Amino acid sequence: GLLNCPIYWQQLREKCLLFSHTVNPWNNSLADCSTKESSLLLIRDKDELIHTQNLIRDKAILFWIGLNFSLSEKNWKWINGSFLNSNDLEIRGDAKENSCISISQTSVYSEYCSTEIRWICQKEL
Amino acid sequence: GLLNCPIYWQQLREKCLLFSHTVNPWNNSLADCSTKESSLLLIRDKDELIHTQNLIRDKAILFWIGLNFSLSEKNWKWINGSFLNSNDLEIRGDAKENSCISISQTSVYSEYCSTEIRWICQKEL
Ligand SMILES: *[C@@H]1O[C@H](CO)[C@@H](O[C@@H]2O[C@H](CO)[C@@H](O[C@@H]3O[C@H](CO[C@H]4O[C@H](CO[C@H]5O[C@H](CO)[C@@H](O)[C@H](O)[C@@H]5O)[C@@H](O)[C@H](O[C@H]5O[C@H](CO)[C@@H](O)[C@H](O)[C@@H]5O)[C@@H]4O)[C@@H](O)[C@H](O[C@H]4O[C@H](CO)[C@@H](O)[C@H](O)[C@@H]4O)[C@@H]3O)[C@H](O)[C@H]2NC(C)=O)[C@H](O)[C@H]1NC(C)=O
Ligand SMILES: *[C@@H]1O[C@H](CO)[C@@H](O[C@@H]2O[C@H](CO)[C@@H](O[C@@H]3O[C@H](CO[C@H]4O[C@H](CO)[C@@H](O)[C@H](O)[C@@H]4O)[C@@H](O)[C@H](O[C@H]4O[C@H](CO)[C@@H](O)[C@H](O)[C@@H]4O)[C@@H]3O)[C@H](O)[C@H]2NC(C)=O)[C@H](O)[C@H]1NC(C)=O
Ligand SMILES: *[C@@H]1O[C@H](CO)[C@@H](O)[C@H](O)[C@H]1NC(C)=O
Ligand SMILES: *[C@@H]1O[C@H](CO)[C@@H](O)[C@H](O)[C@H]1NC(C)=O
C-alpha cells in the first residue's frame, strides 16, 4: 500500500524485518517465519549486521537468525542453502552439533538450538 | 501482475503452490519454503487434499507437507502451531518419533523425516 512493508514490520534497505515478541527454539522460529511467508534473517556482511543491530534498543536480548551448524558438512549453513562465506559475522562460541546463530545489538553468538529466544523474520523488497 | 501467482507457481483456489523438482529431507524442505517466503503446504480438509492431489501427474511421487510428529504431545502438528484436527487426511503408517507427513496423488503417508522426497510450498492469496 503506502509504504513497502506489512504493518508491524520494519523496513531496512531492501528488506522488511519482524522482530518477535515471544521466544522459541530455533526450529520453531523457522516454522514461524515460514508460516508468515518469510525467511529467518539472512545477513550479507558487516554493514548489514550493524544496520540491523542499530534497530535494537535493548542490548541484552538475543534473536535467532537463519544460520545453523550442519554437522555432516562441518560448517555454518544459511537456510537458503549457502555455506557461511566469511568471518564478517565474527561468531562468538562453539561451532558444533546442534548449534544455531543468534544476534544481539552488540554481538553474534553460537547458541544451542534448543535455547528459547526471540527471532527475526525477513521479506525481500 | 497479470495472474495471481509468481511464475512457476500453480494457483489452486486461494493459494499459490510450488511443487519442487529436487528432493530433500523434511527440515531442508521447510528451510526451502522459508527461503522462498512461503509455508510448507497446509491442508484444511479432504476437499483441499483432493484438489491438490489432482495437480499431481506421476502416481509414484511423494511430497512433504507442513505436518510432522511432535513427540511431546504424540500428535501430528502443523507448522503454523496448530495440531491436526480431523481424520480427513487418513494418514497411512505409524505416528511415531521423527515422522513427517507426505502426500501422493492417491494417499497421505507418515515417512521418516530424513527421507529425501519432493515438497510443496504455498503462498496465500
Ligand atoms: C544466502 O544468504 C546469504 C546471506 O545473505 C548470502 O551470503 C552472502 O552472499 C553474497 C553473494 O554471494 C556474498 O557476497 C559476495 O562476496 C564476495 C566476497 O567478497 C569479499 O571478498 C572480495 C574479494 O576480496 C579479495 O580480493 C580482492 C581483489 O579482488 C582484494 O581487494 C581483497 O583484499 C581480497 O584479497 C572483496 O572484493 C569484497 O569486498 C567488497 O565488499 C565488502 C563487503 O563486506 C566491502 O568491504 C566492499 O564493498 C568491498 O568492495 C569482500 O571482502 C564478493 O566477491 C561478491 O561480489 C560479487 O558479487 C556481487 C553480487 O553477488 C557483486 O556486487 C560484485 O560485483 C561481485 O561480482 C559478493 O559481494 C556475501 O559475503 C555472503 N555473506 C555471508 C555472510 O555468507 C548467500 O549468497 C545466500 N544464498 C543464496 C543462494 O541466495
Ligand atoms: C494451521 O493449518 C491447518 C491446515 O490448514 C488449519 O487446520 C484446520 O483448522 C480448521 C479451523 O480450525 C479445522 O476446521 C475444524 O474442523 C473440525 C473437525 O471437523 C471434521 O471432523 C468432524 C467429525 O465429526 C466433521 O463433522 C467435520 O465435517 C470435519 O470432517 C470442525 O469440527 C470445526 O467445526 C467448526 O464449525 C462447526 C460447525 O459450523 C462448529 O463446531 C465450530 O463453529 C467450528 O468452528 C472446524 O471446521 C480443520 O479441521 C483443520 N484441518 C486440519 C486437517 O487440521 C489450522 O486452522 C491452521 N492454524 C492456524 C493458527 O492458522
Ligand atoms: C537438516 O538436518 C540435517 C541432518 O540432521 C542437517 O545436515 C541439515 O543441515 C539440516 N538443515 C537445516 C536447514 O537445519
Ligand atoms: C521443534 O523441535 C521440538 C523438539 O524436538 C519439537 O517439539 C517441535 O514440534 C519442533 N518443531 C517443528 C516445527 O518441527
Author numbering:
A (entry chain A), B (entry chain B): 90 to 214
Task: Give sentences from the paper.
Human NKR-P1 and LLT1 are type II transmembrane glycoproteins with similar protein topology: an N-terminal cytoplasmic signaling tail, a transmembrane helix, a flexible stalk region, and a C-terminal C-type lectin-like domain (CTLD). In addition, NKR-P1 promotes transendothelial migration to immunologically privileged niches upon interaction with its endogenous ligand, lectin-like transcript 1 (LLT1). Here we report the crystal structures of the NKR-P1 and NKR-P1:LLT1 complexes, which provides evidence that NKR-P1 forms homodimers in an unexpected arrangement to enable LLT1 binding in two modes, bridging two LLT1 molecules.
The asymmetric unit of NKR-P1_glyco contains two monomers, whereas the asymmetric unit of NKR-P1_deglyco contains eight NKR-P1 monomers. All these monomers are arranged into very similar homodimers, with pairwise RMSD on Cα atoms up to 0.5 Å. Glycosylation at Asn169 is visible in the electron density maps of both NKR-P1_glyco and _deglyco structures. In NKR-P1_glyco, the complete GlcNAc2Man5 carbohydrate chain is localized in chain A, whereas a partial GlcNAc2Man3 chain is localized in chain B. Interestingly, the localized first GlcNAc units linked at Asn116 in NKR-P1_glyco and the overlapping GlcNAc units at Asn116 and Asn157 remaining in NKR-P1_deglyco participate in dimerization contacts with residues of helices α1 and regions β2, L1, and β2’ of the opposite subunit of the NKR-P1 homodimer. In NKR-P1_glyco, five hydrogen bonds between Asn116:GlcNAc and the opposite subunit stabilize the helix α1-centered homodimer. The contact surface area between the opposite chain of NKR-P1 and the localized GlcNAc unit is approximately 125 Å2. Conversely, in NKR-P1_glyco, the first GlcNAc unit at Asn116 is well defined in electron density in both chains, A and B, of the NKR-P1 dimer, while no electron density was found for glycosylation at Asn157. This suggests that although the glycosylation on either Asn116 or Asn157 can contribute to the dimer formation, dimerization might be impaired by steric hindrance if both N-glycans are present simultaneously.
